[PDB]
Design a protein around this ligand. Structure first.
Ligand SMILES: Nc1ncnc2c1ncn2[C@@H]1O[C@H](COP(=O)(O)OP(=O)(O)O)[C@@H](O)[C@H]1O
Ligand SMILES: Nc1ncnc2c1ncn2[C@@H]1O[C@H](COP(=O)(O)OP(=O)(O)O)[C@@H](O)[C@H]1O
Lengths: 433, 433
């Protein structure tokens, strides 16, 4: 229960809208703003009978949340008509809930948002009113690739929703959300990078500074066995090839570790891959924040000599960016579920599942979607390799930390870097309202 | 320099034909016989500058010998025409060789035998017609299945060779081959079963023994969990799926061990599987002979708690058929290659490859072909599934030890056990010559 979080104007304004008011609110930052920090400070220090949810199972386990389809008992094929037949597991709850938070709201499609509103409108405190009158708190990175919509759905989805963004859902317009944008980049020496990114957001590109970009299209391929460059790909398939090809053409023995599921857990979504295949000298990424304060979620390293085990489970030493030769051991992930405790006036969260695996994954290459909400010091913006579609360039650039660590494989650097101005329309509406 | 071999008439007659004479010889056993015993006693205690070969890489590593393709530089697709263009790696050798042994000759197809004869006809010591004069010693079990012949090659193979068995090759006919059959059953004592099996051999079975066979012809199932049983299948696909089905169902944690290849080896013929996926409580097969004298090749067991005490490597504790608790650790297999050294005026064997892996594999089900030369106390004979072969039943029955341990999946059985009388013809020719 600590207080070491630097309460600035935006932070204090957001907490004001959150706790003392019961208004629907939308808080955005871009990577470093304190989205998880603000959410969790509210989460720990409130008595407001709240429920914290997240779109994916990976996002839910990280925030210790409830994996929304599970919280509402939504089948993978849910629709605005089938939602009406859903019987709540925990019917007694959603009458008592005062507020509900949703993290990483960027990747919640419009149809699912409308299903949520209908569900809370029928089972909420005040039925008929938006969300049953329950205060809704949205937290996410607007500067994100919209939720994909398969080719089959495309024809009629285009006719129901203007965009797969959550903010183009009919329920979001009929309800008023106070807008708060986190602008402060904490623990960030990324000076002039965010100014460049904000310049790319607007029409202020200052193409002298655009060609100040044109300086880092080096090719000559290459990297180093030391410089920890990560490839950002558009699809799993390409990231999956770079991980394997780098894993091959590499000597030493491979070590394979199988994740263990206790209780109930889906595969996917797993934070760490189920089969951890590590050779000596393998570039890896750590997928959780260390309690002991040694590495963070996304801290890259290089697998080094494993000492083998004493009578406990074996460890994987890793050579971090700064040093560091840290012993990584398997980490326990838990899958929560919120419920009301009839005994007292409180909503408790029991754990229905456990998952055990080394918190690491091969980190020679990653996909943009997998790297949502992460910044890497040295990145490689690789080939498409089948379509570099509209507005994917601003997101990929927003994955980087500095310009002197950015290497652009293809020197494309042209006039569709622009953030995909559906978002831009939404932001210019709310910032000036 | 061991002398513990109890040199029975058959044995002394076979060694006499081997050592003092230079005649081609054909020794057959029934896998309880002294085949490996005779081969290794001759191998160790001789001064005859010989070369020991085996068809597969697995059979070669077990006998500490070389594969036929490796010794002759035979490409996987060799034909009798292309053999003439093969340049020997070690041309100088095959002038010095006095004898050549070939173990597990049962699984040597006719075309390969003719290629061997042609090669030694061209490069051998005094390279005339009979293998270039090199004395050939063949050792194998005739009671095993013939070497498979793909459907494509079948049409024209059928017209050149009457059967894919080695004795229907050409060379053999114009080859003086003394015949010795090890018929005496080396104990573990085979009392009722070998008499019944030999009765099926000579088609002299009695319907008293058919009815006494029909007694273990029962429907239903299950293995008594401890009680070790195995399902002998016709195909890898069926047997290996049963190993997976028993492995998924059973609870606990998975442990994955990767074999390490040093130098040069093969991925097709490995003694232990390359990826050992082992759960606690899993039936295993202990697939090599322990020097310390704790378990034999084929001695089945059930994995019990794996004590991962390390500062080098962890140990897999296994409960044998009698008892038990043996610590199984990785075993080193080596791939030899013979060469002639004028300095010692003899045939030395250097090791060009090494393979390290725990000598274990899941043993809920294995294929007849994999289990060549083995007897198991408790066997489950399925239907193939389906109608196994013309003559697969006799081999499957010859895999068993006793009738009070053989369990036949289904009573259909009517009479198709009969030995594959191409073998019967050959055996009645040589036994009465
Ligand atoms: N508002 C803030 N006050 C104090 N520290 C912050 C704040 N925002 C970010 N930080 C620092 O930055 C780090 C990452 O913040 P985080 O909450 O993960 O940002 P986001 O959730 O936007 O990714 C935290 O470890 C914290 O130390
Ligand atoms: N000549 C022999 N003298 C004594 N015991 C033998 C002899 N041959 C075989 N045995 C017994 O049979 C076992 C297997 O013999 P082996 O040569 O491996 O048979 P095969 O080659 O037919 O599998 C040996 O462990 C041994 O105890």
């Amino acid at each position: 229960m600590i207080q070491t979080v630097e309460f600035n104007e935006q932070f204090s304004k957001a907490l004001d809208l959150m706790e003392n008011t019961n208004k629907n609110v939308l808080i955005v930052g871009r990577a470093g703003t304190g989205k998880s920090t603000l959410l969790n400070y509210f989460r720990n220090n409130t008595k407001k009978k709240i429920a914290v949810l997240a779109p994916t199972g990976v996002a839910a386990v990280n925030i210790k949340g409830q994996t929304i389809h599970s919280f509402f008992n939504f089948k993978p094929d849910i629709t605005l008509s089938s939602v009406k037949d859903i019987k709540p597991k925990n019917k007694e709850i959603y009458k008592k809930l005062d507020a509900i938070v949703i993290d990483e709201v960027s990747m919640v499609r419009a149809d699912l948002f409308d299903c949520i509103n209908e569900f809370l409108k029928i089972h909420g405190k005040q039925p008929g009113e938006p969300f049953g009158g329950i205060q809704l708190i949205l937290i996410g990175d607007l500067y994100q690739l919209p939720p994909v919509v398969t080719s089959s759905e495309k024809k009629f989805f285009s006719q129901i929703y203007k965009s797969p963004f959550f903010f183009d859902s009919i329920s979001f317009n009929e309800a008023e959300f106070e807008f708060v944008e986190l602008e402060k980049v904490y623990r960030q020496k990324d000076e002039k990078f965010i100014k460049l990114l904000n310049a790319i957001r607007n029409k202020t590109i200052e193409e002298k500074d655009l060609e100040e970009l044109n300086k880092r299209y080096i090719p000559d391929f290459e990297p180093d066995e030391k410089e920890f460059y990560i490839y950002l790909t558009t699809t799993n398939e390409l990231a999956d090839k770079i991980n394997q090809q780098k894993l091959e053409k590499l000597k030493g023995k491979k070590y394979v570790y199988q994740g263990y599921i206790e209780g109930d857990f889906s595969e996917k979504d797993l934070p760490a891959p189920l089969e951890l295949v590590i050779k000596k000298g393998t570039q890896v990424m750590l997928l959780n924040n260390d309690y002991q304060g040694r590495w963070i979620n996304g801290s890259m390293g290089r697998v080094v000599d494993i000492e083998k085990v004493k009578g406990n489970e074996d460890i994987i030493w890793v050579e971090l960016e700064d040093g560091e030769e840290v012993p990584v051991q398997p980490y326990e992930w838990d899958m929560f579920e919120f419920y009301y405790d009839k005994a007292q006036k409180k909503i408790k969260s029991r754990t229905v599942g456990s998952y055990y695996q080394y918190p690491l994954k091969p980190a020679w290459a990653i996909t943009i979607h997998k790297s949502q909400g992460l910044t890497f010091d040295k990145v490689i913006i690789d080939i498409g390799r089948g379509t570099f579609s509209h507005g994917q360039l601003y997101v990929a650039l927003s994955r980087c930390r500095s310009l002197e660590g950015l290497v652009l494989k293809k020197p494309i650097s042209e006039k569709y870097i622009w953030l995909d101005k559906r978002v831009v329309s939404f932001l210019t509406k709310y910032q000036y309202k």
